[PDB]
Amino acid sequence: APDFHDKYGNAVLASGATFCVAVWVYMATQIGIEWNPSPVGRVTPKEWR
Amino acid sequence: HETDEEFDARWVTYFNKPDIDAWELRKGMNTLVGYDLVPEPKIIDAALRACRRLNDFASAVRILEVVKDKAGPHKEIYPYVIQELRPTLNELGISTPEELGLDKV
Amino acid sequence: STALAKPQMRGLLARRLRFHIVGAFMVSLGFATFYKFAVAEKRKKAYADFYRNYDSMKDFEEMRKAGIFQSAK
Amino acid sequence: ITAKPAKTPTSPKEQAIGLSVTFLSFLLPAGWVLYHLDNYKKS
Amino acid sequence: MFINRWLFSTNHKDIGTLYLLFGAWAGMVGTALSLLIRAELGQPGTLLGDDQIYNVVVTAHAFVMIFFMVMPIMIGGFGNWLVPLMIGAPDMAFPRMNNMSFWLLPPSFLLLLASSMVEAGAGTGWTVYPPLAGNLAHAGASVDLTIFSLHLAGVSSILGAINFITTIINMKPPAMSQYQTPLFVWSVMITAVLLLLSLPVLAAGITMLLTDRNLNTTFFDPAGGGDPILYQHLFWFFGHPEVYILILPGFGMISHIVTYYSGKKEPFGYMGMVWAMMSIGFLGFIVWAHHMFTVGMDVDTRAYFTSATMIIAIPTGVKVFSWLATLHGGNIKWSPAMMWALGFIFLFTVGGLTGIVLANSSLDIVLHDTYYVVAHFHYVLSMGAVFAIMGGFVHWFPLFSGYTLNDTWAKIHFAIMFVGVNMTFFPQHFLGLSGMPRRYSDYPDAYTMWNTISSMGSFISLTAVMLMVFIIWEAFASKREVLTVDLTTTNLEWLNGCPPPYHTFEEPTYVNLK
Amino acid sequence: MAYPMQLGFQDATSPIMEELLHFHDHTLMIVFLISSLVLYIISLMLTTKLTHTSTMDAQEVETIWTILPAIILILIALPSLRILYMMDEINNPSLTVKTMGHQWYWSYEYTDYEDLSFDSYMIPTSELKPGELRLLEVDNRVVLPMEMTIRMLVSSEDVLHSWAVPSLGLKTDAIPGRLNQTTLMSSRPGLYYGQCSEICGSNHSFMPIVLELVPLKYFEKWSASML
Amino acid sequence: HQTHAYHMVNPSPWPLTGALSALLMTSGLTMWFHFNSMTLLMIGLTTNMLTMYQWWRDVIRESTFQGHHTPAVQKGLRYGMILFIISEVLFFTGFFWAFYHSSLAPTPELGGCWPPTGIHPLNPLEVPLLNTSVLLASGVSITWAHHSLMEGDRKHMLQALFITITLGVYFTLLQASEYYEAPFTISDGVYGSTFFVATGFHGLHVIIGSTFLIVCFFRQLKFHFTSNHHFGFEAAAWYWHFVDVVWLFLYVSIYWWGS
Amino acid sequence: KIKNYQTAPFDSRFPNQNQTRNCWQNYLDFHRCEKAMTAKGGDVSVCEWYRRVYKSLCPISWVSTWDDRRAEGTFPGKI
Amino acid sequence: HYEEGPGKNIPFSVENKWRLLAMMTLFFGSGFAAPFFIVRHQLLKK
Amino acid sequence: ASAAKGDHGGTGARTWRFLTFGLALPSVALCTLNSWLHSGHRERPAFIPYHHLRIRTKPFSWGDGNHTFFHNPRVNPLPTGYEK
Amino acid sequence: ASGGGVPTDEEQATGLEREVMLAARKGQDPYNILAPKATSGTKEDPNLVPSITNKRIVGCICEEDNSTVIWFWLHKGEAQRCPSCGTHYKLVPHQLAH
Amino acid sequence: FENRVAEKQKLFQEDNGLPVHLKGGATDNILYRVTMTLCLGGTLYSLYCLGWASFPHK
Amino acid sequence: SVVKSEDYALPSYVDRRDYPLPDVAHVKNLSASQKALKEKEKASWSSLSIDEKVELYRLKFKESFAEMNRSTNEWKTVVGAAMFFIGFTALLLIWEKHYVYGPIPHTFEEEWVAKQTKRMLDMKVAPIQGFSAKWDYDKNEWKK
Ligand code: HEA
Ligand SMILES: CCCCC/C=C\C/C=C/C/C=C/C/C=C\CCCC(=O)O[C@H](COC(=O)CCCCCCCCCCCCCCCCC)COP(=O)(O)OCCN
Ligand SMILES: CCCCCC/C=C\CCCCCCCCCC(=O)O[C@H](COC(=O)CCCCCCCCCCCCCCC)COP(=O)(O)OC[C@@H](O)CO
Ligand SMILES: CCCCCCCCCCO[C@@H]1O[C@H](CO)[C@@H](O[C@H]2O[C@H](CO)[C@@H](O)[C@H](O)[C@H]2O)[C@H](O)[C@H]1O
Ligand SMILES: CCCCCCCCCCO[C@@H]1O[C@H](CO)[C@@H](O[C@H]2O[C@H](CO)[C@@H](O)[C@H](O)[C@H]2O)[C@H](O)[C@H]1O
Ligand SMILES: C[C@H](CCC(=O)O)[C@H]1CC[C@H]2[C@@H]3[C@H](O)C[C@@H]4C[C@H](O)CC[C@]4(C)[C@H]3C[C@H](O)[C@]12C
Ligand code: CUA
Ligand SMILES: [Cu+2]
Ligand SMILES: [Mg+2]
Ligand code: NA
Ligand SMILES: [Zn+2]
What we know:
Chain K: It comes from Bos taurus (Bovine). The structure holds 13 protein chains of 13 kinds. Chain F is of the alpha+beta class. Chain F is 31% helix and 26% strand. In chain F, the strands form 3 sheets. Chain F has a 5-stranded mixed sheet, with no helix packed on it. A 3-stranded mixed sheet of chain F has the order 4-10-9, covered by helices on one side. Chain I is mostly helical. The site of cholic acid has 6 residues of chain G, from α5.
């Protein structure tokens, strides 16, 4: 007889992957986290003195 | 210690013992499959004939499945062993696991 | 019909192990050739090249003019 | 190992309840403290 | 009946179960403290307060995880349950003194919780160095309550070590030599010798610290001719053997779990595994000043401690390669306990190799007191002691309880924890090479990215700890009762059924000499 | 100082620090290789249905397992101990500077000639000037002459601290009643930062070290102006 | 019914009362040092004494009165007592290490010398040598007690053990007098610290060993020992030799070499 | 000779990281010298070297504490 | 004697899974919550 | 190193009794005389308030906080000198 | 010099200690202090395993010096064989208070 | 004195199901209750003292 | 048939590819036709039908090798559920960021970072490899 994995395995894999990627991308990009990446190639240095 | 031939000969003799009992048949096959080899046809032949003296058809079939399993992904080994055993399979009326559908998952 | 040939039946796990422990070693030599060339040698060369004609007074004057120091304006 | 089938099967719904209550027993009390940290400090 | 059975116990299995419950509760306390550390550090700035409350939390995190989670679970919990069964003994040699080793732990833990409630806590580091821990910079009761907590944990484990040594030497079947005992039993015997010799020296040093703080002695105060560096020697003369005490019973469980799920009757190279654990226990007493390479010691002393510390890699490597050779040719069963043991082999090897980096005293000048050391020991502690504990807990839970876990959930639990702990600790190597100090509540802005990711990792391990509690609940809630277990001919602790009767081996095994 | 997303050591400011970087690269390669050799044997053990479960002889293979690790340890220890004794060699300083750790700041004393000493405290975040570094800048920097061997002597007047400057390869603990010595030589002018490296109470995170390395004549005039 | 020789002990409250005595003594010392109160501490000392008394009473009931100490049980208790003595040796080792660390490298605060400036050590040829003779003598008299007991001689066992305890008490009274007379105190820098804490823990162990010998004396009076079975006496004799050897190391190290 | 004094030279009596006894010995030597010199009527200027060396090596607070204790009659080293 | 067997060799009852859930929640939950309340306590004092 | 006595050829209590009364107790009686000759108050040294002695970093938990546990007025000065 | 007054074990040992001492005098080992010596272990000459019940655990150290012990229950009835080396064992049940 | 060990052996071996710490009779029950009451009461008192000492004092 | 907890000391049945001939038959009690089939098995096996041979095999053993060794879909559930709970973790972290953490320090403001970057380049932070090495001091721009 098919067990839990045969019947629901594909859906648990697809939905858990979709959910995980969506929520981490949102967390990483949309809520004001300051990752502080390298300025190299990114920041234009500005006069400080 | 010994040559491959001597190893094989001691196992053939083990299973060829006329009054081998059920416990010794099981001890022999469950010991033999712990080694790094698939048993030569002549060893399997003597184990299958021990199954016959012990009136145990099912264990003859299981021995054939364990040969296939001990070959791992070398899929050329089992068909060669069954080829070599066919005269004994026919003489004892042993069906292979495939002829019985017992290879289906 | 034709009979199947007899295949090797004995020492299959030992044979597979022999084959791969040697492949595992050959990476290690090949990776050791990388790593060393991509990181270690590259570092020795970045330090040697940097210091070869490095002028510490000129580096100091550039810093002093950029106003970084307490002791030197 | 082999084992008997469950004497008192815990259905998917009951597992969702046990899992929720277990997660909340850790998340709620710590979340209440962390939420009120500014209250504790600015006090 | 309840009080006679659970407060007055003289039974090694019930006392083992008490230790497992205590160590599990401590593990939730040490886990919360670890998440407060990572919440403080998970963005730049100050979350909680200054370094006092922060290092109270860091200090309690270490003491709880070491003394109240790992030691009680590995030695009190698995040692008591398994050792007498693996040698066919009817109980421990001193079954009533065994119950006092257990009961001294709730009061020890109470004292440590009292330390953190009174005054401003003991924000000293788990090493409790003076003068920061002395009565001028840590006035008031907190640090004395911490010392007393360690005295009580110390007596509990010294009496436990006497009990295990005596039991293992004296209560085997008369035909069984010490070279016919399982590796987990050897691991407990060696760990108990290390406890017996090292704890009294820590007890001497923290007693000296107690009298400097309350009797006007000056062991560690230069004003009286004392020396703060003497405390460090006495503490680390215990503290290095202590990390081998935390891992050895783990090595013993890993040997059994690898053997069993490789379908083998025995571990590869049994006498080399015994030799390796004895040599590691021995060498673990002559290396302690690798914790003191920046204190100003002489060059030749630093050369000797570098070399002796590295030498431990030789017997330790024998064990790693012997676990590989035990998997070799196995009929591999991918059970959740097997996954925990394979994770152990790989993560312990990573952290042992960063320990080798650090044994070089010249490089340790720059890595000492930075997060490179934090990364080294969390790879051997939360990805070695913790993984060996979770491997042995899922492996033997059906023996102790009579019920099975759901293996799918337990594999999911292993997968979440393996991701979380590597996300947490792997970036701390970068923080340490680039110079972030230990015991800091906040860091220069350049260290933001790796601290953020390390904190996100600690939350993933929090989700794993919550799920583990659900998994244990689900097993007791569903009551799937164990029927047969594989390989009892080489795993004697299963042969009396699951769970075994309260009294086992009332008639001893029969073992002939021949 | 460290920069964002940094993986490895700060760039070397001193020849000894340079030696440590090459020695770390030598060691880390070994590390790489052993960890990968293990991961790989391990996946090899776990990826076949072939079995061999009967007793295996351990003697021969245990020789490989002890000897090869012993040789790899000797290949690490030889250059490790060369560096250890090289840093210990006599080098004749031109200047001695003392630093005393305190809760929570460092003081500095340059008393070869005059009585010069001052305190050095972290710049509070709310007083940083634009472009200055949070938790790292100090009000009074440790000005020192570049390209000169300097003896630093380190102690404390209260609890333990530890005086560190990672780009020069330096970390010496500050212990009351003890005077520990280290030597410092910068190949370059500039500003080189470190942070207290032994837990010392409420503001352990907030008592940094800033060295300012400049030509001798500038160091002399700065010294005279600090009296 | 068992067919092994080992002892299944009856369920007992004493491990719990002893663990709680420990909590009460340590929280009591904390109260005493910081909150000016001796109450918790006296309750913990009382419950610790009550626990010791009833636990060891029960071990005498289990052995002398109920017969559970077969040879295999006794052999375990031998190992137990040896391992306990080893852990007490290591505890003293920490204080010897503290003594040699401070005395071999005397700091400037002491005058850069040992004994420090301003310290006037006791003369090791006066009461300290007398105490040495006293404890060595009591090692000879306990060995006499042991051989009389093995030879079945009740009266000479009791006479030799009484001598041994009288010498224990003599050393304890001599040491109490020397502590009072000593012109330096525990607060007199690392000299007074090492002196009083190392000799003070040793004096505590002399008091513990003497108590254990007095327990053996009253059990002997009650005929509990046979000429072949008397492990409590052997354990007390090994612990007593331990206290004598520790004294010898303290005498040579602190009183003699350190004077 | 040895004006052009820059700092205290390497001293093979104190070759290790712990230099406490180097400061202490020079402080002692200086004061012992100065007592010898201002006893026997002679010139303290002969003690100058010890004074330079201890000033270079010794923390100001140690010198200051030792000087207060010599004045109080509680300096525990022998001069 | 004492009860023997699955569910009977432990100091807590597993006779009812929901009463068990409550006890396990209180048991592990109180250990996990304690350090947050200690920190709250330390913040509130001063 | 034998020492100089000279026994064996049987064994036990009798010989250890002989050692107890013929050597051990005589040695104690002798040392008890030696001690009771050099006993009795030796004259106390000038008080000097050395900072490495009479340490007080925290008051003692008995008495007025300033007296050691087995304080002897005759020979133990306080941080401020000998009592009245 | 040399009264008695000290009881001997023969006079005063009691309980299990006494049972062990009285049995050892008879050359008997009801409490399993000594290791049993093996027979040749064939089916005609099996190792004989005493027991006070209907089954007892056997550990078989198959060859001298093996570190691996092989454990199994031995039940009343026909001889059984160690599952590693085949040597034979037979249970001989019953009664203790001799 | 006389050797009364045989009397104690008969007492402690009486088949009355008592655990050894109560088998000497009513005085064992009394000393047990005294010990346990001091331990548990002392332990409550120690918790009270923790509560008192956990807060700055008035 | 029916394995009881109270049988743990008895030899038992197991399907394992490394112990092909277990210690007992999977089924020992036989019906009338099963007893007749065991008698027939004592005669030539060529006279057994295929169904009779399969019925003897299934009396002796529970599962065949192909059955006991089959692969399963379990990995989907494990990987998927692990990703689920990892995804749930990010909820916790969103919650903490919204309700627990306050503003980070002003030194992360864009203009501050531009000025600090120039000042790091002016003091030649890590000029050999790590930071200023990556700046072109001639062209006044990041190296390509
Ligand atoms: C379980 C705990 C555990 C274990 C097992 C270890 C194992 C080791 N540790 Fe660690 N360690 C800690 C817990 C542990 N450690 C803790 C808690 C601290 C800091 C304490 C504090 O300050 O709070 C610490 C600190 C610490 C320091 C001090 C760093 C500093 O503070 O500056 C050092 C330095 O030598 C060190 C080294 C090592 C070494 C060489 C090993 C070795 O024993 C590892 C040997 C293992 C291997 C090497 C891997 C397997 C081998 C092979 C696969 C063979 C091939 C290998 C080679 C040829 C090298 N450790
Ligand atoms: C006469 C023979 C010796 C017996 C000693 C009698 C008194 C107390 C007994 C305990 C002895 C143990 C050592 C503890 C440390 C200090 C006591 C040292 C011995 C002693 O009694 O030292 C006295 C000081 O006592 C003081 O402070 C006394 C303070 C008393 C407080 C005890 C402190 C509690 C210690 C906690 C111990 C923790 C135990 C660890 C167990 C380890 C776990 C494995 C010396 O008197 P003084 O006036 O300074 O100088 C003499 C001047 N004429
Ligand atoms: C000043 C007060 C505060 C400090 C507390 C300590 C105070 C004093 C404690 C003194 C120790 C008394 C111990 C009495 C033990 C009596 C029980 C006993 O001796 O029991 C014996 C077994 O030995 C056994 O368990 C041996 C078990 C003995 C171990 C005890 C010895 C030391 C314990 C010391 C605690 C150390 C504290 C360390 C300080 C850091 C009984 O077997 P037998 O003698 O063979 O008799 C049977 C024959 O009759 C049959 O024919
Ligand atoms: C380190 C481990 C911790 C990980 C993170 C925990 C995740 C949080 C779980 C939720 O915790 C709850 O969150 C609510 C907010 O969502 C809080 O309500 C607070 O906020 C509500 C909305 O503002 C108000 O209605 C409530 O009265 C007020 O208590 C509540 O107290 C707290 O229990
Ligand atoms: C049934 C089992 C047994 C459990 C027994 C529980 C006993 C409870 C009694 C507590 O009351 C007392 O209160 C005293 C004072 O009111 C305190 O002493 C202290 O009290 C003050 C604190 O400094 C000072 O006035 C004193 O000098 C100092 O000794 C001290 O806490 C205690 O003696
Ligand atoms: C009364 C008693 C007789 C012993 C007995 O056989 O019951 C004797 C035998 C040995 C005696 C003891 C030992 O001779 C040693 C002690 C000597 C002292 O002079 C009196 C008390 C002393 C402690 C004695 C008291 C008592 O007279 C004892 C105990
Ligand atoms: Cu100063 Cu940390
Ligand atoms: Cu260490
Ligand atoms: Mg440090
Ligand atoms: Na922070
Ligand atoms: Zn066998």
